[PDB]
């Protein structure tokens, strides 16, 4: 596997354990209750790093949708993700270490309902 799929599988194994639905994209016939997680396949740069290995920067985005009725709970999901996915993730072929994490939130009215949209970006240096 690439580091992309290895990390993506670890992030699914994690977020899929909380009991809320986790998806890559919603299909039209599929009914999803709030809150829910969208998780998007990582990007990965690679370059020569030592005479014996590559290294690179692998970017993960996970994306949390909720009704705005209770923001303390939505923030509980954000903090739960970050605490499970940092400082380091470890898998069969690869190691990942948080370089930075960026949290941004929007109030979204596209759906005739006031939703909260949090986008969590984590940059992992990988070895």
């Amino acid at each position: 596997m690439t580091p992309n799929l290895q990390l993506y599988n670890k992030a699914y194994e994690t977020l899929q354990g909380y009991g809320f639905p986790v998806i890559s994209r919603k299909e039209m016939q599929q009914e999803i209750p709030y809150p829910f997680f969208v998780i998007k396949m990582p990007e990965s740069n690679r370059s020569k790093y030592t005479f014996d290995s590559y290294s690179g920067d692998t970017n993960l985005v996970i994306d949390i949708w909720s009704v705005s009725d209770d923001l303390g709970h939505h923030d509980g999901l954000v903090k739960r993700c970050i605490d499970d996915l940092t400082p380091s993730v470890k898998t069969n072929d690869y190691d990942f270490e948080e370089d930075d994490t960026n949290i941004t939130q929007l109030v979204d009215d596209t759906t005739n309902q006031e939703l909260l949209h949090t986008s969590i970006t984590i940059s992992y240096k990988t070895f």
Binding site: I23, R25, K26, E27, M28, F36, V38, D63, W65, S68, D69, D70, L71, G72, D75, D108, T110, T111, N112, Q113, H117
Partner: protein
């Protein structure tokens, strides 16, 4: 107009944000059902950031007018937000869109 269908009006009453508990729990006022007339149901693809949803954009009509504040309707088991209301002499007409 044939006014066959029955609509339930609602007002979702917007609460103040409480920063001590991080909640802004709204409350719904909900009214007795009224005879109305409504367009045939659509179930269009609408394409949000997270993916496809079955939307319904529609118009609903009632004879004379209602005394009371409203914001959403429930009819045919679908809940809609009112997005225009148009007030003729003897008739009121509501443009409505499904939520979600």
């Amino acid at each position: 107009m044939r006014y066959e269908d029955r609509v339930i009006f609602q007002l979702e009453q917007v609460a103040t944000y409480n920063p001590k508990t991080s909640k802004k729990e709204n409350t719904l006022i909900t009214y007795d059902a009224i005879p109305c007339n409504i367009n045939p149901i659509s179930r269009a693809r609408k394409q949000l950031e997270f993916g496809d949803v079955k939307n319904d954009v529609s118009v609903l009509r009632i004879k004379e007018s209602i005394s009371y504040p409203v914001s959403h309707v429930l009819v045919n088991g679908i809940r809609y937000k009112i997005v225009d209301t148009r007030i003729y002499r003897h008739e009121t007409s509501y443009y409505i869109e499904e939520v979600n």
